[PDB]
Write a protein that binds this ligand. Structure first.
Ligand SMILES: CCCCCCCCCCCCCCCCCC(=O)OC[C@H](COP(=O)(O)OCCN)OC(=O)CCCCCCCCCCCCCCCCC
Ligand SMILES: C[C@H](CCC(=O)O)[C@H]1CC[C@H]2[C@@H]3[C@H](O)C[C@@H]4C[C@H](O)CC[C@]4(C)[C@H]3C[C@H](O)[C@]12C
Lengths: 459, 64, 156, 17, 90, 171, 88, 547, 128, 17, 173
């Protein structure tokens, strides 16, 4: 796994030693190049995962998230340069460096062979994000939302540290491969009930979970387009990774502890979908929309059915590709009207023909149009709930409906409408803007041709 | 002449492609194509075994 | 680059504070009044009519005839939901309760009448379409090992 | 079409890009 | 300030405000992204060598049934492990 | 506002249309139309403001249960068959600027005159500001009516878009 | 729908010919610019009927506010010519 | 065999070749509009070669031509089900599409995006054909959505018109709701059963299939616009007439019933589905006509006029008539779609006028239009030996001569006469009486292209429906024996509708003032189901969302 | 006869039946004129920017911002121990959740025993 | 459009063929 | 699909009737069928042979890997990665093979249903009944495990199932 870590590092001198005007190109050229080598990680095996050394390893589940992250760095740069053109030379190198490190932590995160090492990198991954969101934020309203991240450490990380340590002392090791064979039946006790909360509450907040989501709508409202993409495309997906792996040792306790979590989503999905119809912001509408899809994953992981895991893998993938594109698509308008309000500009299909083609294209797969992977996973999970419980179909049906209702509305409100008379800076779509969307939509469909690469490890 | 192009360009070629792919890349597989066994009628002979369909019984001879 | 004072704020509990809010959104002091002071916390925003956009005249040459909204006008707290696309509260053609109860009649009427017909359906006074071979027990795949009860529907 | 000429100019979005 | 890119360069791609530099940043995106990964990467994933031994299982499964069909053996044993080696307790 | 005197007309013309759709047939329409106008001429000579004020309540309370179940509406007017059906094709004029050079090369002549059209959109703008400051009451302008240009060569202020507003049929 | 062209000269009689069947007017006294109230000795209530005929004649509604002021045939032509953007 | 299967799959791929030419290349602009039509023309021929072989051999072929996916003990493929329905329903759809194909090449000459217009018309056709030929629920599901989405754009072609945006989402809202049962059905066949391939589903013959079928019942509730999820179907008439002609008259609306037919072996034994479906059509089949007796919109009336025909189709399935109901699908499509096109002729000469009360004097001023208007109506009303009568007389056989609910047969005939009632109210204003259109005359239909379009679609109803009956092989025991009045009750009540409406129509000539009536408005205002359920329900979901 | 329509949230009254507007006195004349002039001044104030060639951008509406600003109400209003809405409002958001707690749980508890006794059908069930 | 082969009338029977 | 054995894929013979035309009009299908041999089949076969011939000159093969049996989980020790790993992979691979046997058998049912058609019910007693046998064994071995299947769990379920029937069997006597 070193063959991808060092060249990722090597971008840092390239980001710095490079000439003045080739800073963007050089990283873009190689960053795209590295992802090509990333595809090599698809050498999975039917019975065994891929174990390089004691420090990194990637199974079938890990790789698809790895490809998305590496595939996503160049796309983040493309959108970035428009708003950074005015910034001075030194800072751009600073911002670009954080992404390179952000990718470095991520790629090492999902490939980590030892849980604590994963725990360490998990905490590290946040640090670049906070700078990016804060240092180059889009607002100055001082929301004072620190308590949420303080709450994260209090109810999340910090408890997780103790439980991880406790397991090692008791079981004798935290190497996931060892855990496969030394996993012990976790009987019922008040201590274990406390241990269980330590292994999961940390990942629930990041997904996020309904009720615990207050940071996400306000995190995107301020994070720049460069910061937003990784957050919803990668950072949200960290929790599922650990939750899928960590849940290896929480049985049978999870058989009843999941219900308060399951109910939060099952009902959480509808609540978020409805509010989006009321939202007054392109990004915020996507925010809760993000909570919607992530809610489905939580249910899949907890029930731990062979189909749940398969469907969960694509939902993170498709949503990551979906929302990431939506932010870029939404941020395309921001490049003209410099606003997040959804009603300030309307009828843009009258002036941005090819832009609307993406809008219609992206929205189609947002609501899980068949046979796209957006629906393969989402439709995979819906069936699994039926064996767990037949009643669940009511909420999934309602959620899909409303998710189909607001998804087309946002498209309807903006593109299908009458142009704003006073607006007078709707310039034609630039090559960069259209190119960025195209890189998103295209592979999203291609994977539909071959589903065997994001089916998860159960396949 | 404008109707001559469609005959070979858009029709004949695909059926060669489809049939060629059908002939070797489909038919060469099991149960990729399953066709209902042909119907059987009285007064019919089978090519394979020279089979015979016993003629039905004489009808009650209605007005016909 | 907008002043703090010209933004939604607390509930004004005295007319003197209410003077700004009405003025703030270009609503004369008479037309202005906010939600009751409670935990609802909707701020010093006004209480505009619960009406849709289609009700407003389109013949006027608005800045935004699409929305039938003029620049500088206030917006209903849920004016987004009252837009032409969304819920419309234009005058209705027929009486409200009767309109709702006009639906109630026909739909409620039919459901039960089916159950009335279910007890006494309609048919023809003829016997079964008789079949040979133990009532098609074997044609329906019936197990050959265990023969069915003999069936012979005699002539007549 | 129906009448010779009678051609009226079209205002369009700039399609080049 | 949101300055335009079609004034100084009437054909700016949308990568920068230098007409000379903009062209290259366009070419790199459209080569390594499309011409390489979305083309070759898309091609490469197509011919992956029996991913997760999916194809291998079918061939092995077919062979096993032949022996069981002809010899009359049960199509699939009803117990995963040999009952003999499940050394029972008590 | 608008006075009740004009409010009489707003039911005179509208009531006919629902009657018109009810009439359907041409001979019926004129005859029934004469019936309605005859009723109007029952009180058309009534000059009592109290009664004329009071001779409109019932009419509005009378028409409600006579209004058409499916009243007819003209095509191009709001709610009609061609209600903004072609707004999706109408294109703003101000977007002319972003036209690509090569694209503009097809119509060299038309764009040449526009520069003069915009020319008087710029030079005339300054005096257009003052042109309202003699017809500008204190306390905000009383109405939205506008004056013409009281000279030669200029144009009434606040005119650019309406004069340059697209045509009814883009195609 | 092929082409439904519109010409001001052709429209000229369409507005005026509507008046040519009125039973409250002498056709010859009527002029292109004649004011209805004074030159034609008519009334607003009478003027309402003329405005209505244009909607059956041409097929497009007329606002109440602007219908009244159209006391001159040229103005009525202007309303029809200007609303449909007919100039020749 | 090889020839039969090989030549069959060409149509689906052949139709898609023009689409592949829209995303690529710029070789020949200005000729695509004809390009697509000829492909259907060519496609029809390749859609008739299977017709000959199928009838002679009855070779129902299921072709699995790929191994797409595989889960534990599942397998998905891009397969097709070459069988009776595809071989017999495809030719009609192309025939209608072929007529509509050249119809749209003239009507939409006013659209610069005409080329875009065809970029989607050919798309929908592809999805619909894939749907019917689908051998599995998933692949079948794909078409269930393609028709849903392709309708969205085609419904809302003129995106400016608020009616399009509201109506388009109204249908999408309903269309999605129907899928809830669809996704439910897959789950049940995946939990209790283990696959989505019809081979295993039918052979296993489920013993308790109430739940899976209940989802199927819902599937047709909104997609086919049955009552309870009906209102959207008329709403489609806020957009292009040619768009309404194919999607919402002949091709998409048939989806709801089709699934029940495609699952005929399962639907037979469970009568719980039959009753509600039988009753569902019963409430709808009259509620459509009962509403339609006094509606006053040419395009919407046709929609309601189509609604009742669709509403009755459920009753036809509700009476357990698998292959007899199938005929009503093809038979209705021909003229009704032609009526849309005929309504196009009226709207053309009228220069964008649609009120039924603004039409008349068209018997000789519109000679060709008048020509085909009666045949569809007479065929629609059940004229003997015509396309619509065969189903109308045949379908009423079992329902009135087999075990059925008492109330089910009640609305069965009450609306049956109403079927002809609005037709007379239509042909009256449409053709009878002196002209009532605006002063200027824009009437002209000496357009050879449309005459070709009318020619092709005028013939089929007269003769094709007759021809279709002969070739199809036996699959049922026809109930040729029954009381003469029951066999002729349709032959008795049929003339009543014309006369009864004629009694209603002509008495309105007399110069007598009118009088309001509640029922005159309850049916006219659509029973208040849309006027109410499309205000509060949006308000409930949205006004309550913020809390 | 002609029973006057009952005014409802979803059905605004017809314009020519409200008794307020039939008589237009100073108590109405004064208000009507003030709004027009106030509306006119906004139009005049907006009319400059709309018809000024110099502008190249999107008008920063002050009405829109406040409307958007008021939507994002986070902590500024409302009091924690306000029994009128806190207890009942909190129910709309925590009430129905527990309802589902028993719904699915009861079936699974119900379902499990049947499997323990074979009272439920799974013979051809694999996907789980 | 062969040169207006149909000349529309005003308040008249159509100029058919 | 080079050469698939038919024993695994049963196929009752196809008996296509020899046509016995009695009408007084020519058969229409014949005109097209002959064109199929000359205008479709052979050109479909003529290019193929040109393609085939080179593959005869250039040759190369591939095998079908064979995994030797290894000690099962009952031969492994608690907390012993080496032995446990060798059994886990064996258990995984063998179980993964058992996954297909349901699909292969499912494929037989797809044959007895469509080729036979209207004789489905009486002509699939062997296939339909043999379908159940696969369901019984497969379902018992590797169902109710959960997502994290492992040889210890499946052995536990087999230990669960063997003990369950043990008491009942002795209960009879
Ligand atoms: C506050 C105190 C937290 C409770 C910690 C505790 O009581 O752990 C007791 C237990 C000590 O026992 P030990 O010797 O380690 O092993 C034998 C266990 N039968 O300790 C253990 O054995 C396991 C300790 C694991 C780490 C416990 C993590 C503490 C936090 C648990 C609550 C998390 C709640 C998260 C927020 C939820 C919000 C809804
Ligand atoms: C190979 C040929 C190019 C011929 C050329 O040099 O113009 C390609 C390019 C343009 C195509 C044609 C155009 O698309 C339209 C032609 C006329 C009719 O629409 C039928 C298809 C039609 C016959 C097409 C056949 C073929 O696909 C064509 C003819």
């Amino acid at each position: 796994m070193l063959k991808y870590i060092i060249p990722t590092i090597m971008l840092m001198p390239l980001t710095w030693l490079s000439k003045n005007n080739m800073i963007w190109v050089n990283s873009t050229a190689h960053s795209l190049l590295i992802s090509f080598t990333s595809l090599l990680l698809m050498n999975q095996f039917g019975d065994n995962s891929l174990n390089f050394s004691l420090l990194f390893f990637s199974d079938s589940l890990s790789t698809p998230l790895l490809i998305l992250t590496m595939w996503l760095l160049p796309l983040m740069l493309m959108a970035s340069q428009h708003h950074l053109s005015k910034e001075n030379l030194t800072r751009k190198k600073l911002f670009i460096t954080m992404l390179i490190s952000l990718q470095l932590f991520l790629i090492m995160t999902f490939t980590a062979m030892e849980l604590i090492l994963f725990y360490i990198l998990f905490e590290a991954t946040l640090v670049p994000t906070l700078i990016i969101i804060t240092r180059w934020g889009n607002q100055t309203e001082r929301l004072n939302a620190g308590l949420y991240f303080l709450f994260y450490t209090l109810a999340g990380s910090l408890p997780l540290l103790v439980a991880l340590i406790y397991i090692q002392n008791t079981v004798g090791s935290l190497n996931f491969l060892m855990l496969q064979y030394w996993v012990q039946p976790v009987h019922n006790s008040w201590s274990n009930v406390f241990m269980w909360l330590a292994c999961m509450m940390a990942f629930m907040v990041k997904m996020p979970l309904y009720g615990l989501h207050l940071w996400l709508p306000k995190a995107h409202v301020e994070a720049p387009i460069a910061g937003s993409m990784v957050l919803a495309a990668v950072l949200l997906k960290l929790g599922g990774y650990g939750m899928l792996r960590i849940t290896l040792i929480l049985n049978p306790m999870t058989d009843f502890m999941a219900y308060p979590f399951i109910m939060l989503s099952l009902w959480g999905m509808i609540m978020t979908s409805s509010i989006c119809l009321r939202q007054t912001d392109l990004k915020s509408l996507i925010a809760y929309s993000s909570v919607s899809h992530m809610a489905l994953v939580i249910v899949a992981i907890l029930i731990q059915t062979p189909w749940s895991y398969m469907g969960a893998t694509a939902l993170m993938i498709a949503h990551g590709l979906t929302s990431s594109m939506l932010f870029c698509l939404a941020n395309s308008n921001y490049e003209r009207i410099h606003s997040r309000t959804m009603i300030l500009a309307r009828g843009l299909q009258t002036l941005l023909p090819l832009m609307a083609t993406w809008w219609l294209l992206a929205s189609l797969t947002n609501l899980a149009l068949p046979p796209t992977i957006n629906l393969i996973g989402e439709l995979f999970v819906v069936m699994s709930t039926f064996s767990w419980s037949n009643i669940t179909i009511i909420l999934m049906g309602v959620n899909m409906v409303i998710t189909a209702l607001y998804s087309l509305y946002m498209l309807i409100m903006t593109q299908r409408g009458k142009y704003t008379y006073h607006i007078n800076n709707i310039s034609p779509s630039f090559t960069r803007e259209n190119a960025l969307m195209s890189l998103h939509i295209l592979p999203l469909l291609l994977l539909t041709l071959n589903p065997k690469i994001i089916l998860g490890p159960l396949y | 002449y404008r109707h001559s192009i469609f005959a070979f360009t858009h029709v004949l070629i695909p059926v060669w492609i489809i049939h060629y792919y059908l002939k070797y890349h489909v038919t060469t597989k099991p149960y990729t194509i399953v066709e209902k066994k042909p119907r059987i009628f009285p007064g019919d002979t089978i090519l394979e075994t020279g089979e015979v369909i016993p003629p039905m019984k004489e009808f009650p001879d209605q007005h016909h | 680059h907008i002043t703090k004072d010209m933004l939604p704020g607390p509930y004004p509990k005295t007319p003197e504070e209410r003077a700004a809010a009405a003025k703030k959104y270009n609503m004369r002091v008479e037309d202005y009044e906010p939600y009751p002071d409670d935990g609802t916390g909707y701020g010093d925003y006004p209480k505009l009519p619960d009406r849709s956009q289609q009700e407003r005249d389109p013949w006027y040459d608005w800045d935004h005839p699409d929305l039938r909204l003029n620049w500088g006008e206030p917006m209903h707290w849920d004016l987004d939901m009252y837009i032409r696309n969304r819920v419309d509260t234009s005058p209705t053609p027929v009486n409200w309760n009767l309109m709702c109860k006009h639906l109630f009649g026909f739909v409620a009427f039919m459901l039960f009448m089916f159950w009335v017909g279910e007890t006494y359906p309609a048919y023809q006074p003829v016997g079964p379409k008789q079949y040979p071979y133990n009532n098609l027990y074997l044609e329906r795949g019936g197990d050959p090992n265990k023969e069915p009860e003999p069936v012979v529907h005699y002539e007549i | 079409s129906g009448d010779h000429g009678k051609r009226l100019f079209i205002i369009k979005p700039s399609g080049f890009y | 300030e949101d300055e335009n890119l079609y004034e100084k360069n009437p054909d700016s791609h949308g990568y920068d405000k230098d007409p000379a530099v903009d062209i290259w940043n366009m070419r790199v995106v459209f080569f390594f992204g499309f011409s390489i990964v979305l083309v070759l990467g898309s091609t490469f994933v197509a011919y992956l060598p029996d991913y997760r031994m999916q194809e291998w299982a079918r061939r092995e499964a077919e062979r096993l049934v032949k022996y069981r069909e002809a010899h009359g053996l049960p199509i699939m044993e009803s117990n995963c492990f040999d009952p003999s080696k499940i050394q029972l307790p008590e | 506002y608008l006075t009740h005197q004009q409010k009489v007309l707003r039911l005179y013309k509208r009531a006919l249309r629902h009657l018109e759709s009810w009439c359907i047939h041409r001979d019926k329409y004129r005859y029934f139309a004469c019936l309605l106008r005859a009723r109007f001429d029952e009180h058309k000579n009534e000059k009592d403001m109290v009664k004329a004020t009071q001779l409109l309540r019932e009419a509005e309370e009378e028409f409600w249960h006579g209004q058409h179940p499916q009243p007819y509406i003209f095509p191009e007017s709001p709610g009609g068959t061609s209600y903004e059906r072609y707004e999706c094709y109408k294109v703003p004029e101000w977007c002319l600027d972003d036209w690509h050079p090569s694209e503009k090369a097809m119509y060299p002549d038309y764009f040449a005159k526009r520069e003069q059209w915009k020319k008087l959109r710029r030079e005339s703008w300054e005096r257009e500001v003052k042109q309202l400051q003699e017809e500008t009451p204190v306390g905000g302008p009383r109405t939205e009516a506008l004056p013409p240009a009281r000279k030669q060569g200029d144009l009434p202020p606040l005119w650019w878009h309406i004069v340059t507003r697209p045509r009814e049929r883009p195609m | 729908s092929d082409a439904p062209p519109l010409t001001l000269e052709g429209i000229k009689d369409r507005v005026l010919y509507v008046l040519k069947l009125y039973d409250k007017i002498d056709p010859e006294k009527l002029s292109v610019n004649s004011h209805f109230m004074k030159d034609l000795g008519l009334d607003s209530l009478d003027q309402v009927e003329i405005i209505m005929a244009m909607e059956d004649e041409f097929g497009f509604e007329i606002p109440d506010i602007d219908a009244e002021k159209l006391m001159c045939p040229q103005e009525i032509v202007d309303y029809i010519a200007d609303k449909k953007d007919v100039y020749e | 065999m090889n020839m039969f299967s090989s030549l069959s799959l060409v149509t689906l791929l052949l139709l898609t070749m023009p689409i592949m030419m829209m995303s690529f290349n710029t070789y020949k602009p200005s000729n695509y509009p004809l390009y697509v039509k000829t492909a259907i023309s060519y496609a029809f021929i390749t859609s008739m070669i299977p017709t000959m072989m199928f009838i002679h051999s009855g070779q129902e072929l299921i072709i699995s031509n790929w191994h797409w996916l595989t889960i534990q003990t599942l397998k998905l493929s891009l397969s097709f089900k070459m069988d009776y329905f595809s071989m017999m329903f495809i030719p009609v759809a192309l025939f209608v599409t072929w007529s509509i194909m050249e119809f749209s090449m003239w009507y939409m000459y006013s659209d610069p995006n005409i080329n875009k217009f065809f970029k989607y018309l050919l798309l929908f056709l592809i999805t619909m054909l894939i749907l019917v030929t689908a051998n599995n629920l998933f692949q079948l599901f794909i078409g269930w959505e393609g028709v849903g989405i392709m309708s969205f754009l085609l419904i809302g072609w003129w995106y400016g018109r608020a009616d399009a945006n509201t109506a388009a989402l109204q249908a999408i809202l309903y269309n999605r709701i129907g899928d809830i049962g669809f996704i439910l059905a897959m789950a049940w066949f995946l939990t209790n059963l283990n696959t989505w391939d019809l081979q295993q589903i039918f052979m296993l013959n489920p013993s308790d299939s109430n739940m899976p079928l209940i989802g199927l019942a819902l599937a047709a509730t909104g997609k086919s616009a049955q009552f309870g999820l009906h209102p959207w179907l008329p709403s489609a008439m806020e957009g292009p007439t040619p768009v309404s002609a194919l999607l919402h008259s002949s091709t998409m609306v048939v989806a709801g019933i089709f699934l029940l037919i495609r699952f005929y072996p399962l639907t037979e034994n469970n009568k719980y589905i039959q009753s509600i479906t039988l009753c569902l059509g019963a409430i709808t089949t009259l509620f459509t006509a009962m509403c339609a007796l006094t509606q006053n919109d040419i395009k919407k009336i046709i929609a309601f006029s189509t609604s009742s025909q669709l509403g009755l189709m459920m009753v036809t399935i509700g009476i357990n008539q698998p292959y007899l109901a199938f005929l009503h699908i093809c038979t209705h499509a021909f003229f009704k779609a032609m009526l849309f096109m005929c309504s196009g002729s009226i709207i053309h000469s009228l220069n964008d006028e649609q009120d039924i009360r603004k039409m008349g004097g068209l018997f000789k001023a519109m000679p060709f239009t008048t020509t085909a208007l009666i045949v569809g109506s007479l065929a629609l009303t059940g004229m003997p030996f015509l396309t619509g009568f065969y189903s109308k007389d045949l379908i009423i056989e079992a329902a009135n001569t087999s075990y059925t609910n008492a109330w089910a047969l009640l609305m069965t005939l009450i609306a049956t006469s109403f079927t002809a009632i609005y037709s007379t109210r239509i042909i009256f204003f449409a053709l009878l009486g002196q002209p009532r259109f605006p002063t200027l005359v824009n009437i002209n239909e000496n357009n050879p292209l449309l005459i070709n379009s009318i020619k092709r679609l005028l013939i089929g109803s007269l003769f094709a429906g007759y021809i279709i009956s002969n070739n199809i092989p036996p699959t049922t025991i026809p109930q040729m024996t029954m009381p003469y009045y029951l066999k002729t009750t349709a032959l008795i009540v049929t003339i009543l509708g014309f006369i009864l409406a004629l009694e209603i129509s002509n008495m309105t000539k007399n110069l007598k003032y009118h009088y309001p009536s509640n029922a005159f408005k309850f049916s006219t205002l659509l029973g208040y189901f849309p006027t109410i359920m499309h205000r509060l329900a949006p308000y409930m979901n949205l006004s309550m969302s913020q809390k | 006869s002609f029973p006057k329509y009952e005014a409802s949230r979803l059905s605004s009254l017809p314009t020519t039946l409200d008794p307020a507007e039939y008589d237009i006195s100073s108590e109405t004349r004064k208000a009507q004129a003030e709004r027009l002039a106030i509306r006119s001044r906004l139009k005049r104030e907006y009319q400059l920017q709309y018809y000024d060639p110099s502008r190249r951008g999107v008008i920063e509406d002050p009405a829109l911002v406040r409307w958007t600003y008021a939507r994002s109400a986070n902590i500024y209003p409302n009091f924690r121990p306000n029994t009128k809405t806190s207890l009942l409002g909190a129910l709309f958001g925590i009430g129905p959740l527990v309802f589902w707690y028993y719904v699915f749980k009861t079936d699974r508890d119900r379902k499990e025993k049947l499997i323990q006794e074979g009272k439920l059908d799974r013979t051809f069930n694999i996907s789980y | 459009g062969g040169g207006a082969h149909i000349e529309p009338r005003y308040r008249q029977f159509p100029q058919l063929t | 699909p080079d050469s698939w054995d038919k024993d695994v894929y049963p196929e009752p013979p196809r008996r296509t009737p020899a046509p016995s035309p009695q009408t007084s009009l020519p058969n229409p299908i014949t005109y097209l069928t002959k064109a199929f041999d000359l205008l479709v089949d052979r050109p479909v076969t003529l290019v193929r042979e040109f393609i085939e011939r080179q593959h005869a000159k250039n040759k190369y093969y591939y095998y079908h890997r064979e995994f030797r049996r290894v000690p099962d989980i009952t031969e492994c020790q608690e907390k012993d990665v080496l032995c446990m790993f060798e059994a886990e992979m064996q258990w995984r691979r063998d179980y993964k093979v058992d996954q297909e046997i349901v699909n292969i058998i499912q494929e037989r049912l797809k044959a007895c249903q469509q080729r036979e058609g209207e004789s489905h019910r009486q002509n699939c007693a062997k296939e339909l009944e043999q379908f159940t046998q696969v369901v019984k064994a497969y379902q018992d071995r590797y169902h109710d495990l959960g997502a994290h299947y492992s040889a210890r769990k499946c052995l536990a379920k087999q230990k669960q199932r063997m003990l369950a029937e043990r008491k009942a069997a002795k209960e009879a006597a």
